[PDB]
Design a protein around this ligand. Structure first.
Ligand code: ATP
Ligand code: ATP
Ligand code: MG
Ligand code: MG
Ligand code: MG
Ligand code: MG
Lengths: 123, 123
């Protein structure tokens, strides 16, 4: 009966980027941290508007273009803190997505849960 | 009691690259196929010597250097076809690795199993 909040990486520890940032800044963030996916926020940290994959950023430099983070980002899968991870694991598998964004009772950013977070429970 | 061979992507369907290839060729392979990890073989397809992550290839162009695939590739986790996926899932989690290389009774390349292959069993 484990829930998302029990395995999530909390907001305070999440590497993020603003949708106004450049792709060069995003590449620097990806390189320094090593993560493959970083949430994208608009104005406020609690306003998650997308996720940014390092792949899409590297492939866009294809060729140098007018690509903005808002164009390369994709919609996240938002879930409540009470979501049971046995359901989340199957749901992420159907979507072929690695990361879900956890929201609190106010609909604000609480943290993230990846498949690796859920599998960490099983040793 | 499901085994690796029952969920693996067979050799015939695996995108690979030779350790003599250039990093530019590897980037082209990653872009056309979309995969994040491709096995590396030496001389013969059945002689898997490493795995190549698109991240390490993109980060090496850091700066243009004398990087060879043999330098950027890492050791794979080899398993038999009879390996039970319940054990493999936990083993990959401990290693933080996404892909395992399946070998046949002759120790030759049979296929690959990723976490997504094992999770596909659960819907
Ligand atoms: N942007 C991020 N900020 C903070 N923690 C993150 C971030 N992305 C992933 N994590 C955490 O890192 C740990 C490993 O997650 P995961 O393996 O899915 O990410 P990754 O190593 O970036 O990706 P991958 O293995 O698919 O290349 C988990 O705890 C996950 O919560
Ligand atoms: N190099 C490859 N050649 C053929 N099939 C592959 C290859 N890499 C992965 N697959 C298959 O693709 C499917 C999805 O695997 P997986 O999600 O681990 O890979 P990916 O999409 O390349 O990586 P990721 O989601 O970590 O960026 C699985 O069937 C896996 O067997
Ligand atoms: Mg995938
Ligand atoms: Mg709370
Ligand atoms: Mg990881
Ligand atoms: Mg056989």
């Amino acid at each position: 009966d484990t829930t998302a909040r029990e395995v999530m990486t909390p907001r305070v520890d999440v590497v993020m980027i603003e949708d106004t940032a450049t792709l060069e800044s995003a590449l620097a963030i990806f390189n320094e941290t090593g993560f493959s996916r970083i949430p994208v926020y608009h104005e406020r940290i609690d306003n998650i508007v997308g996720l940014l994959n390092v792949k899409d950023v590297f492939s866009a430099v294809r060729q140098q273009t007018s690509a903005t983070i808002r164009d390369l980002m994709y919609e996240p899968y938002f879930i409540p803190e009470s979501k049971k991870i046995d359901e989340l694991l199957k749901e992420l598998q159907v979507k072929k997505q690695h990361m879900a964004v956890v929201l609190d009772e106010y609909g604000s950013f609480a943290g993230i849960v990846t498949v690796e977070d859920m599998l960490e429970e099983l040793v």
